[PDB]
């Protein structure tokens, strides 16, 4: 009894298109594409989110369940006649003129009883198919089985869909008007198509569609990955023969972080450009970026304004005090993002989450009840984040009270060096104590076990340790970053120079960094101010970590306070099973709490 109407207002528009943009020499041609508008007036258009950034030349993804009814209001703002044909239903519209189509997504269009919740088809202008598709009028059309789409039509389950069109656009068949003007592309892009990001060991659904001539034939290859054919039959393919006029869907479970390539692997074509890198993020990428632990310096925080004494340098999760948060006198920020706090990672990183908190003068609560998040790589071009969002942008829900932490996810991971937060709703005044979450873009940068426990106690062993007869024992396996309670760290029985703390990674791992933290117990701030690393593969014999060129051991600067964190990266990673920290300098007493970073090999 479903028959839900799915409204779409799509127009055909002339634009300039630059293949290669994210990579040739002048590859921009006039083109005509399917653009998504917000309503019948075709005045304001529906901004393209992060979820469909990879779409490139394709139009908005029309989508629908079975028995559903698709009604699209086609405007057509181009100079000549065009049309919107939906290949898979089962007349040339003149410029500046509208016309509503009405398609009934029958069972014949849906997927198969066994696998893949959704099936791929395609829509495009049909006045002159070939000359039109080659001009840029083509888009993905998905048909799912009842219950696959959510209130605001997106896949929740398998989730994470991708729509790649492997095809050659021959500008010699369009607004040519007047050499080989051919582009062996993916979604109309050559060599680099941005927007492809997924999580390690996560199931994504691929919709591969090739609407090109007979000489196309493209063997889509996902490096280091294995495609899966889900249906009344399951087959593990390693590459898939995508033939002309065909549409195919096949899931894939990404494996291992890093930058991998996507190509047609029909050599001659692949080198012409039918390829793009695609990013696989670490499975547990959501670690504190440093606002709440000290890793991010006051220098890196900056706002456009702040209500007297509630300075930006204060917006740190949990930081307590009379003045312990950033507050703006006004959140007048509407079609303006003026009230904002900016965090500069100083380098690009992966942002996958944001946590906010309010402040409390004394008894008067202060907090943000809603905000927006913008990012940039240069600091010049910003992008207001969107994803699920039913509005032009994502309007994250803020806090309810002034102390509880509000957790917010970023639909699809984004790359940024500058995160810009701006309150759009509040109780009294937009106060904010916040923390950003993520990891390194290149992966292999997550914790190894110190703080969780994956690394068990019977793995941490130090030269010496304390045990004062007042019931205070500081065993080595307590040097777990962020420890609390009784004895929360490692105490060096002696504060000399040749003391050591080592961890048994039980196997050879890839060590990319380390985080060190002091300890504030018995009212005495003691911590390791400097160290040196030694690594072993079998157990004995150590090789002092040295720089790209030297013979002296490496001196890593540690912390300068009791609670703060300090991160050190190993330019050339460490490949071993044993790691040793050799305190060289400190304050009052040698104590520790640490965590390592790296991945399996």
């Amino acid at each position: 009894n479903t028959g839900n109407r799915k409204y779409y207002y799509i127009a055909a528009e002339e634009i300039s298109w630059d293949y290669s943009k994210f990579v040739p020499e002048d590859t921009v041609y006039k083109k005509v594409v399917f653009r998504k508008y917000l309503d019948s007036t075709f005045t304001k258009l529906d901004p393209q989110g992060e979820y469909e950034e990879h779409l490139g030349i394709l139009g908005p993804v029309i989508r629908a369940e079975v028995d559903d009814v698709i009604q699209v209001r086609f405007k057509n703002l181009a100079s000549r006649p065009y049309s919107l044909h939906a290949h898979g239903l089962s007349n040339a519209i003149q410029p500046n003129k509208t016309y509503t189509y009405v398609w009934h997504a029958t069972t014949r269009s849906g997927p198969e009883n066994p696998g893949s919740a959704c099936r791929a088809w395609a829509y495009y202008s049909a006045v002159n198919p070939e000359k039109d598709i080659h001009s840029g009028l083509i888009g993905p059309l998905l048909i799912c089985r009842k219950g696959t789409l959510d209130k605001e039509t997106n896949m929740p389950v398998d989730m994470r869909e991708f729509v790649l069109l492997f095809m050659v656009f021959d500008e010699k068949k369009s607004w040519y008007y007047d050499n080989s003007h051919e582009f062996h592309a993916i979604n109309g892009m050559i060599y680099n198509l941005p927007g492809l990001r997924m999580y390690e060991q996560e199931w994504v659904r691929l919709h591969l569609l090739n609407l090109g001539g007979s000489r196309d034939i493209h063997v889509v290859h996902f490096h280091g990955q294995t495609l899966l054919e889900n249906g009344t039959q399951q087959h593990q393919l390693g590459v898939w023969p995508l033939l002309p006029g065909s549409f195919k869907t096949l899931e894939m479970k990404a494996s291992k972080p890093g930058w991998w390539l996507l190509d047609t692997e029909v050599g001659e074509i692949q080198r012409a450009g039918m390829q793009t890198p695609f990013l696989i993020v670490d499975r547990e990428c959501k670690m504190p970026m440093g606002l709440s632990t000290g890793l991010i310096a006051d220098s890196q925080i900056q706002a456009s304004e702040f209500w007297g004494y509630w300075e930006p340098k204060l917006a740190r999760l949990n930081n307590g005090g009379s003045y312990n948060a950033w507050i703006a006198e006004k959140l007048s920020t509407e079609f303006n993002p003026e009230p904002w706090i900016q965090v500069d990672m100083q380098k690009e990183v992966l942002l996958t989450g944001i946590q906010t908190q309010g402040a409390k003068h004394y008894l008067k609560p202060y907090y943000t009840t809603e905000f927006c998040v913008a990012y940039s790589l240069d600091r010049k071009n910003w992008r207001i984040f969107k994803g699920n969002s039913t509005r032009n942008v994502m309007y994250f829900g803020g806090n309810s009270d002034a102390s509880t932490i509000k957790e917010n996810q970023i639909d699809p991971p984004v790359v940024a060096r500058y995160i810009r937060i701006s309150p759009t709703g509040s109780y009294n005044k937009p106060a904010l104590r916040l923390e950003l979450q993520g990891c390194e873009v290149n992966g292999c940068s997550t914790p190894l076990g110190m703080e969780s426990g994956k690394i068990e106690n019977k793995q941490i062993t130090a030269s010496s340790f304390k045990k004062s007869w007042w019931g205070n024992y500081w065993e080595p396996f307590l040097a777990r970053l962020n420890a609390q309670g009784r004895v929360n760290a490692w105490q060096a029985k002696a504060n000399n120079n040749n003391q050591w703390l080592q961890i048994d990674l039980l196997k050879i791992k890839k060590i990319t960094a380390i985080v060190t933290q002091g300890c504030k117990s018995l009212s005495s701030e003691m911590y390791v101010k400097s160290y040196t690393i030694h690594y072993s593969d079998q157990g004995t014999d150590w090789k002092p970590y040295r720089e790209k060129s030297s013979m002296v051991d490496k001196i890593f600067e540690g912390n300068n306070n009791v609670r703060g964190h300090v991160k050190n990266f190993f330019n050339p990673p460490i490949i071993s099973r044993f790691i040793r920290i050799i305190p060289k300098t400190w304050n009052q007493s040698i104590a520790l709490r640490l965590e390592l970073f790296g991945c399996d090999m």
Binding site: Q233, G238, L243, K253, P572, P573
Partner: protein, 268 residues
Amino acid sequence: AKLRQFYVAAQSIRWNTSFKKIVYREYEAYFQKEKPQSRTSGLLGPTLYAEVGDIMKVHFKNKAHKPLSIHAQGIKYSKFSEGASYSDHTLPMEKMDDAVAPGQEYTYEWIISEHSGPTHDDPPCLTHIYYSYVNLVEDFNSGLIGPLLICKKGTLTEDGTQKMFEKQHVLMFAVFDESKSWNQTSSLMYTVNGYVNGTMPDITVCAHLIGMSSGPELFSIHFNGQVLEQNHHKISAITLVSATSTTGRWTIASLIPRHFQAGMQAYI
């Protein structure tokens, strides 16, 4: 969960007139000598195989006059075991697996895992292929290429051979074009393991296809014996494309206006 070993290497070798070409060769122990295979398998390289769980280790020793690599297209490798070069932002320790210089020898380590192998509704052993990525149009054409086979639990032999099936071949309907290779030698050549219209040691019957071609291409291998059973149902013929492999006296031709009318035929 055994471990597999291989010591295949790259080397130039004249080849049926003749041309100077490159091919992958098996080699053994620590690279003492190879045990060629005249019976068909013309330019076709070795034939790498393993089973789910088998942490295989492929040793490569280049001897050609151009840097090359081992690019398996069917395994979940890592950056230092992939075999390709592009901006993946990795460090040199991980870049020295992409290009192996003329005379150097490195070992690709592939941890063929469970969820990276055959399904249950598919053949007992999946067929894939490998080649050198260092240069796609050259390497292949210059004769480089080679079948890879990932099998299921107790389906492969302890001596590297099909189990309860035995005697499976490896036809490689692959058209070459010497114009695009080592030498600027204008010579098209629709083959079947390198061999043209003929001169290919067939094999009578007592009763694993590939289809390279560097450019856009589709091969329609038509067998003359109902021995082609895909899963649980037979098909008259099989179809392949430029880089997609698939898992008595008669002929095996490809009834296509430019394959059967040009010598592509492997007599059963």
